[PDB]
Amino acid sequence: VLRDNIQGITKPAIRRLARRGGVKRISGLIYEETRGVLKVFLENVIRDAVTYTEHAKRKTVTAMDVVYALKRQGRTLYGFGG
């Protein structure tokens, strides 16, 4: 039982990420597409990590599954575990 939580990724959060990316002015329709793109990226990574958790016969998606799911997509994550 949940709600629509993609509205929780607020307008200042996308604003701060875009400032870190280094942009000066942001159009008003950036935010909806940024939410859609983030949802697509998470539906890739989370699906691969959940498959990794399925194969181990576990229920806790650990950090290693997320690192391997990111490594399979060519976005290697140094940091957690390794």
Binding site: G22, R75, Y78, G79
Partner: protein, 106 residues
């Protein structure tokens, strides 16, 4: 008696790398000079990365390497950026840069 790392003059472990090459099923017969060569290459790469990280730490007036220092050291260099292009560093940053068009005109 004498460990193979000390005999080869390195500090990365030779026996552990030999075990990981044998039991990481890369090929059937892992040779003798292979773990020494691999440990030397890995030790050189770590020495280069830690030297640039220590330079970035001294330039930032800190005496302990944080992940931002590693991000700065890797991306301020060019050939390490070619090596580590596809990797992101956790709790790192981006290089401080901005395009000249966005800067206010004088």
């Amino acid at each position: 008696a004498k460990s193979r790392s000390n005999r080869a003059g390195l500090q990365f472990p030779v026996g552990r790398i030999h075990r990981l090459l044998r039991k990481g099923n890369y090929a059937e017969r892992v040779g003798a000079g292979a773990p020494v060569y691999l440990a030397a290459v890995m030790e050189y790469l770590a020495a280069e990365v830690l030297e640039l990280a220590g330079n970035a730490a001294r330039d930032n007036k800190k005496t302990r390497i944080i992940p931002r220092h590693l991000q700065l050291a890797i991306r301020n260099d060019e050939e390490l950026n070619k090596l580590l292009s596809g990797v992101t560093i956790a709790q790192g940053g981006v290089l401080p840069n901005i395009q000249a068009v966005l800067l206010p005109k004088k």
